[PDB]
Amino acid sequence: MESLTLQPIARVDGTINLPGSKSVSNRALLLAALAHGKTVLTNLLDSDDVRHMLNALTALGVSYTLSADRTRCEIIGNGGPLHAEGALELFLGNAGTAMRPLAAALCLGSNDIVLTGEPRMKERPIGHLVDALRLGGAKITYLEQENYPPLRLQGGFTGGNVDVDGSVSSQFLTALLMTAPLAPEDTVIRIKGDLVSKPYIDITLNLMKTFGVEIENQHYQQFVVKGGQSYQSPGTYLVEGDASSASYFLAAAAIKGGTVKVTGIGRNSMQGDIRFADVLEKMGATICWGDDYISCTRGELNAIDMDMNHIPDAAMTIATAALFAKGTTTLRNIYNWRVKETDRLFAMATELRKVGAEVEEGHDYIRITPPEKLNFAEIATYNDHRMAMCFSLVALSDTPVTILDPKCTAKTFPDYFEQLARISQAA
Ligand SMILES: O=C(O)C1=C[C@@H](OP(=O)(O)O)[C@@H](O)[C@H](O)C1
């Protein structure tokens, strides 16, 4: 199959202008499609997950244009809930930010639509979301395995008292929050117990406010939403650079810099993954913050033992950076790594051992003890963009590394290797 071999990188130094945020891009596209008026999004991400959302909007009848590089999008808002009948099938690849939000949104009014995706998406849970939507009136059918896509949506979500489990994915709550304002009746969303990935809820609420809707957030345990609302175009909107994509470059400087500056995110960014920079600082790197950049300069790199529930995606980057740190690194409270692009606890542990690390794969944590020296490995990537990007950091050592299916990075970052190469220096 396809593979890419990375030769040892002696030093990293430079500036990277970040690709747009996947989380912000897919929320902005769905809200722009539901809104009244024309929205012009700039710095939109061009990646597989965004392309699946754009294709779904096209299939649903939404009109929009894209610039040549697909980072500028002018969307003609539908002025209300989207509609299609005839069991129209929307293929959503493995994009949670399209699958979860559309599963909720398309329950408004009457519809007859099927949502499906790649084989792995049919193994990613959606039951907590379906349960909540049904409590609000939605008619939803599991076409294959109970609690997983594919789903046949027949509409009916009117609002009301809705409980939702927040212990497995914050995306279910995000989907409900974006949908409820357009339901005819008021909705009170009650979180059953724990809520994981809380920072992503703040991104959702930030986007909803940009599009003209606010709700009452009672300590992230209950959300009061008034029905009969409408989203309104914000005119022009600048999508933040992606803070998760930024993690690889900031970590590379922490290991082998040099100073690497990423632009497009800064201290005021809404993305919780900017907190990844705080972890590098705790490990010994030097961080500089700007309005529109974050930079990292090599310092020391010491192991850490931290709860990473607030940054599940960027936390994977600490798992390979740990190969270069002094001591044993432990990342805790990351159970849902198991239900994402792949089971990331199994995948990360398996591949880390291949380059020499001693790894304890905990049920919901990972403990990593680096080897005295890394060895060569051909890294399996599990159709997971982050496995490829995280293991690219192995090349910041004296050994090359071969990454299988490097194009899997296109889920969120098609140009990843060219960008890592931009900051890679031989001297
Ligand atoms: O809402 C979002 O944009 C995302 C939320 C997170 O999912 P969980 O809430 O399932 O952790 C994250 O891992 C995913 O890549 C993007």
CATH number of 50's domain: 3.65.10.10
- Residues annotated in the binding site, as ranges? 22-23, 27, 96, 124, 169-171, 197, 313, 336, 340, 344, 386, 411
Ligand 1 — pocket residues by CB below 6 A?
23, 96-97, 169-171, 174, 196-197, 200, 312-313, 336
Q: Do 131 and 247 fall within a single domain?
A: no
Whether residue 72 lies inside any domain: the answer is yes
Q: Which among 223, 257, 284 is the end of a domain?
A: 223
Residue type for position 95: A
Cα 315 to Cα 386: distance, rounded to the nearest angstrom: 10
Specify whether 339 is located in the same domain as 400: yes
| Way the structure was solved | X-ray
273 classed as catalytic: no
Interatomic CA distance for residues 78 and 33, integer angstroms: 6
Note whether 215 and 253 are same-domain residues: no
Residues 132 and 210 in one domain: yes
- Angstrom resolution of this structure: 1.6
Contact present, 137 and 214 (Cβ < 8 Å): no
- What's the CA gap between 207 and 201, in Å, rounded? 10
In a shared domain, residues 135 and 284 = no
Strand order of the sheet with strand 286-289? Answer: 14-17, 259-263, 293-297, 286-289
User: What one-letter code names the amino acid at 209?
Assistant: K
Same domain, 271 and 125: no
Cα 303 from Cα 325, distance rounded (Å):
5
395 in Cβ contact with 8 (< 8 Å): yes
- Asked if residue 28 and residue 91 are part of one domain, the reply reads yes
Question: Cα torsion for 31, 36, 40, 45, to the nearest 10°?
Answer: 20
Best probe residue, ligand 1, of 29, 164, 200 (max atoms within 8 Å of C-beta): 200
Is 117 among the domain residues?
A: yes
Domain end (from 164, 192, 223): 223
Please report the DSSP string for 58-113 in residue order.
Answer: HHTT-EEEE-TTS--EEEE--SS-----TTEEEE-TT-HHHHHHHHHHTTSSS--E
**Helix H segments across 329-375?**
344-354
**Domain with 331 in it:** 1-18+241-427
> Is the domain of 187 the same as that of 258?
no
Q: 144 alpha carbon to ligand 1 midpoint, in Å?
A: 24
Q: Are residues 266 and 311 in the same domain?
A: yes
User: Is 229 inside any structural domain?
Assistant: no
Residue nearest to atom 13 of ligand 1 (CA): 313
Q: Which residues are documented as binding site for 3-phosphoshikimate?
A: 22-23, 27, 169-171, 197, 313, 336, 340
Domains in the chain, number: 2
Contact (Cβ atoms closer than 8 angstroms) between residue 29 and residue 47: no
Are 191 and 336 in the same domain?
no
Say how many Å lie between the CA of residue 169 and the centre of ligand 1: 7
Structure tokens at 382: 């599990």
Give yes or no: residues 163 and 213 share one domain: yes
